[model samples]
Target: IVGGTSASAGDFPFIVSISRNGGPWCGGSLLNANTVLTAAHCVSGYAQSGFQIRAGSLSRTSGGITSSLSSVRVHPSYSGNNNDLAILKLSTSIPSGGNIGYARLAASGSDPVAGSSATVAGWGATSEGGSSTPVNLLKVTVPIVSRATCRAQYGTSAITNQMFCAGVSSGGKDSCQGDSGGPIVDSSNTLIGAVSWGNGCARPNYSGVYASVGALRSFIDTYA
Candidate 1:
């Protein structure tokens, strides 16, 4: 949702709004009818009593399938800013169809190359450090950046093998606040990463860092 344009409902049916205490707070990807993948920070330090997931529709307000959480699992090594990944086990299965679906995790060893086109969708913000979160989903296509280039761009101390970067070379398209834990898909429609953090929202020479699915595939398989 951050620094991106509005997106229609069906464009990213797998994207779901993560709600806490009955309000949308973050974004997540449906792994199956009963599981969701998102950033670990989204549920950190929060009680599980109020957790909920809104799926199957584009509108954040209404007109979608909603389910409560049966359990939550944030990775043991999760530092929020590093291995920032988590999974929400749904109490009820979301029926597939309509504008409802799930995202496919990229397989072992499968990774997107630098300069390849990838999609990031969410309900974050339309501008950096700005208000104006979209009620409808928003999406943007960002080019994948090589690890070496992104590390130098974001600083070596901040980058890790579990994380990678994606964005426009000239900036203006990336995930920002409120989009955390959402999916970043390659051209084959495989979920290669999850929106983690960035220097800023779509700033020049900056890229949105993501939880590398390649690095987290085993974790996903262990629980999902």
Candidate 2:
């Protein structure tokens, strides 16, 4: 995450790294011992065998319980950036304890109101267009933007009800490349959104867009 600080151990127990092959590709949130929630764009078109879910680790590459994916479920309505969410079923459960735990999902229609504070955690790039991702987890707090204001910035057709925006108007902090599918939680640490897309990492006038967990609660309940 750009313009963020290193996260402390256990600070985000529900956060996990979603990897393809052996490299960290995206971030995810543990829904249960065997279920994970992430962005559809992260797992879409990928075979289950090539993916791994690493839990209880601040570092994305090592020091965690790694489990193979058993199945993946992308939202049926997922198209482009709309309904951009996915669920993964793990072959084995990553027991909850220490730095591993289940994330609490937001209730239906409980999306954060405009100007409310929310935290975003991930192992994404620290700078815009940067090629390297951090070895440690990073987090930043951004304010939620109203749908009307967000649509005004990105266009009415671009901001869907299934999505929400978070970041400063003069952006210097946000979820960036490699951070897709990560969790964005409210002050109480409830899963409210998942990192989906953005114009550019921490760019002025552009906020990071995320898949609204509240809006997709029913879809998640069906699969996870």
Tell me the deviation in Å of residue 87 in model 1: 0.9
For residue 126, give model 2's deviation from the true position in Å.
0.8
How far in Å is the alpha carbon of 207 misplaced in model 2? 0.8
TM-score of 2: 0.98
TM-score of each: 0.94, 0.98
**What is the lDDT for 220 in model 2?**
94
Q: Give per-residue CA lDDT, model 2, range 4-60, as digits (tens).
A: 999999988889999888887999999999999999999999878988889999998
Worst 10 residues of 2 by lDDT: 108-117
Assess candidate 2 and give its lDDT: 0.92
Model 1, residue 64: displacement in angstroms?
A: 1.6
Q: List the candidate 2 regions with Cα displacement exceeding 4 Å.
A: none
Candidate number achieving the greatest lDDT relative to the actual structure? 2
